[PDB]
């Protein structure tokens, strides 16, 4: 406890930090899914080809 | 409590913070819907073309 959080508060912070990261990642995944439908990236070596 | 508030104010401020955030977002959603009607973004790879 070099910072000042108790063991329980460390457990509490970690639990909601994990799900906040998960929700943020999940929203980003759908955003990338939608962005891919609008305009895909990673073209073939010959180009996008329309 | 490094903030200086008890647990009573925490849920009080949070509840008001969330509902204010909802009002701000819903208004922004309506603004973007009107903005899309006036001038849509996200063109096709071939352009807008009206």
């Amino acid at each position: 406890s070099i910072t000042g959080l108790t063991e329980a508060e460390a457990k509490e912070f970690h639990g909601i930090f994990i799900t906040s990261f998960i929700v943020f990642t999940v929203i980003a995944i759908v955003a990338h899914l939608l962005a891919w439908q609008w305009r895909p990236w990673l073209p073939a070596v010959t180009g996008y080809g329309t | 409590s490094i903030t200086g508030l008890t647990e009573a104010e925490a849920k009080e401020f949070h509840g008001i913070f969330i509902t204010s955030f909802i009002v701000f977002t819903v208004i922004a959603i309506v603004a973007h819907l009107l903005a899309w009607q006036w001038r849509p973004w996200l063109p096709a790879v071939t352009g807008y073309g009206t």
Partner: peptide, 22 residues
């Protein structure tokens, strides 16, 4: 494609509320 912006705006908003009611 109104849905492309629809998620990136609305979902983080509904994400905070659903996250804050666990």
């Amino acid at each position: 494609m109104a849905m492309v912006w629809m998620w990136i705006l609305i979902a983080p908003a509904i994400g905070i509320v659903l996250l804050s009611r666990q």
